Design a protein around this nucleic acid. Sequence first.
DNA 1: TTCACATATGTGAAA
DNA 2: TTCACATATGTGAAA
Lengths: 436, 436
Amino acid sequence: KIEEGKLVIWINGDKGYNGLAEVGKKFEKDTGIKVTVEHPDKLEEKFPQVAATGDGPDIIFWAHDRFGGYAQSGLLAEITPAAAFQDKLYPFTWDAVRYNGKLIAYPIAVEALSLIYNKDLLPNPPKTWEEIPALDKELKAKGKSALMFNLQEPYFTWPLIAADGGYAFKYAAGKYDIKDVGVDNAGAKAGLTFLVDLIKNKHMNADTDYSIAEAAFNKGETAMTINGPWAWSNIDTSAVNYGVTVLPTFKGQPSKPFVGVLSAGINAASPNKELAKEFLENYLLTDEGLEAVNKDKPLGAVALKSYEEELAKDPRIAATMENAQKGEIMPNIPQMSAFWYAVRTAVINAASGRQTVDAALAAAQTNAARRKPSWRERENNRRRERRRRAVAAKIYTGLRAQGDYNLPKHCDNNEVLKALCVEAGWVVEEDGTTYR
Amino acid sequence: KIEEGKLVIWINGDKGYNGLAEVGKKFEKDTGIKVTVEHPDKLEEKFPQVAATGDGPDIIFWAHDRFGGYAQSGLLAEITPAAAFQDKLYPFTWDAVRYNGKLIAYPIAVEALSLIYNKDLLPNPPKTWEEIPALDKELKAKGKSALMFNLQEPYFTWPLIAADGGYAFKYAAGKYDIKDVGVDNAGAKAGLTFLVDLIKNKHMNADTDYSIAEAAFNKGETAMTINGPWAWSNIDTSAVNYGVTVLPTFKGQPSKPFVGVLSAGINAASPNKELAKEFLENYLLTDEGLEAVNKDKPLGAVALKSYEEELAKDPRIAATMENAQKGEIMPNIPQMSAFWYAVRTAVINAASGRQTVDAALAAAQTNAARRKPSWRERENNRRRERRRRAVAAKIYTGLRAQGDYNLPKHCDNNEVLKALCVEAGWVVEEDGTTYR
DNA sequence: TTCACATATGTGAAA
DNA sequence: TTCACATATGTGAAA
Ligand SMILES: OC[C@H]1O[C@H](O[C@H]2[C@H](O)[C@@H](O)[C@@H](O)O[C@@H]2CO)[C@H](O)[C@@H](O)[C@@H]1O
Ligand SMILES: OC[C@H]1O[C@H](O[C@H]2[C@H](O)[C@@H](O)[C@@H](O)O[C@@H]2CO)[C@H](O)[C@@H](O)[C@@H]1O
């Protein structure tokens, strides 16, 4: 839980939490507050569950796409940065982190996936997805593979799914339209079918996850991987001479990644809103602080306009942004979570053979906008059925008490119902078939 | 799924999977068989789910406590090492992987928790738990804590619960009595009370999981932790000058850690049982084999006598075996996962204040002893209720078709039953109160 | 041991 | 939307 005068932080385990830890301790020196950094599991999941009850973090670092469902659930404090401060960060970043006309988080870094490749094994990386099967057959003879990446999270497969026209929610007339979902269209189909054919043809494994893919690339057993700027640090410490480049094209179209802005909203229930706002506006959204995080695991193209000038020279970032320009910023709306779960289920079920590609994406397209019943709605149902059983139980209690039927010492209500039926001149068969 | 010609291994994420991989690489070099080592989360829970359908890895590594349940489920191959090979391993480690008279895994190494303390920060570590609150007062004056260890897995707290008399399943007449559980006795209550009192009086934090406790000791913010030999590697790379010593006493009694034998089981569905047996007997369970794993993360006291006589020279292993002597080998019976689930919920509930100690342990006693109904018993129940509903449905089907009851276009069975009641000479109020 | 009503929620109906 | 039987399993009674 939260306690005043302390600072506990939540950020995903693939980010530079230790680098932030370094920043939190210097916040100690200036203002005296102890700041701890914890990298929990499924934090994007645990937060909307625990924050209701007061338990949770002062701050949560996460991509912006989930904050719209959060903010609409009243979990985040509205953000009040000076007009001078907004100018310090790129306007498209503030746009990503704004829901309904209120700024719910601080933009920190812009993230896009890129193709990462081993130059020693592959000095010239492929420009197309279509050439990856042939290239894998070549490298298999040398004891390598062409490409491994996280097939458990749809974030990593969406670029291929979008290339030929697959889309989540079509933005039309100034808004995202949840009636027009494109996870079921011909571009989406072709994208997934190709990914599955790669698996069918033993060029990838359906079980490959984030950890397996990183270890294979970092040890040099795979020539390529798809990942974001956070992964660069571990490749750095490895022995692999790598490059960061544009994603392969599919059917001649670019790979279209979903661009996430790593944001930071504050726990509406925190006793330290401004004692944490010191951190966020005057400590992290600063050049010298972002360096500390970026030094641990790279942040990507940070939203601070002054530090991005230095980082933008890095050819790896230029590539990251080259991919971003070809993709789209994620919507931040509430339906994102249901979209991600539906697409996650569709990829895994098609990758594993559990469902055909058509069946998987068809199921996904209906779930991408499924409404989650409200608490009151669940309580409506719960109470209605409690009433229904209470009425029946009183009927049978009375029948057993005053009926004087010829019943066994112990019997279920069906036997009572049968003895009430015959009394009313019905005959009930053994299996329930009933008639006058 | 397992494939002929390759070996996939599952080992926990805190073990030296990178060292195990190096062993795989030698196997692949002498015999030509590829070996992939993976460390997926919740692997001890994922294996029994996938292996029941013939999926899962070729070899699964875990402490021996979990294998009995795997064997009762027919998920493991029987280990058939020649007598010559069995003799190379300590008899008691073979006992740990014996189930219904058969060997169900290869023992690898003996694991026991120890007290890990920062020599510089805390010379002469405490000999009792009772002096721990006092030692935290002084240490908090220097801005440090006394003790942080994983509070989310009961493994780490069990030594204190068992100290004054808590036990899991009582051994009697040559077998563990699954009905005689000792998680509720006075000794267990005294141990969990002392632990909760540490949190109440602010000497410990209830949310502390493995990574928080590890980062704290390694960074130098706590004078002690409780952990196994796998964690020394990470401590070594840190600045900290650490010692490994006997766990403190509780109420003048030694702490009694549950002793684990890290074990390798062979999936019953693997078409590579001979290859797996060759890899385990002639590559892993060799001096060179265990050394490469051990160098990655220390294994503890290995079961192979030849390499153990070298590892025993290490004072950290002597301590670890000093704690082991005070504890007990874990049972391997299938009921062990139900005992761990119960105690896990108990410690977390008491640590958090969601339950009293007495209430949390009472519920854990009942859960740990709970007789798990068999599939057939589950099926009997399912079928019985299915039959009961079906008979009811027919009775109401017939009543609606032939009743002419003056019922609305659509109405629930309760209303049909009401109509029947009045036809038979009853009155039924709205609320179900029924009398003749 | 078997058994039966209780349980919140699921599937899908009727608007 | 609200509604209602179905769902496997829970709780606990009666041997
Ligand atoms: O896979 C669905 C998932 O995608 C994104 O998660 C990213 C995250 O944005 C990155 O910062 C990094 O942690 O990798 C994640 C994928 O493993 C979305 O942000 C997230 O909401 C969505 O569920
Ligand atoms: O916490 C319950 C847990 O205890 C043991 O797990 C140990 C494991 O033996 C060690 O090798 C190490 O990895 O730490 C684990 C605890 O997090 C039991 O072996 C396990 O079955 C049980 O659930």
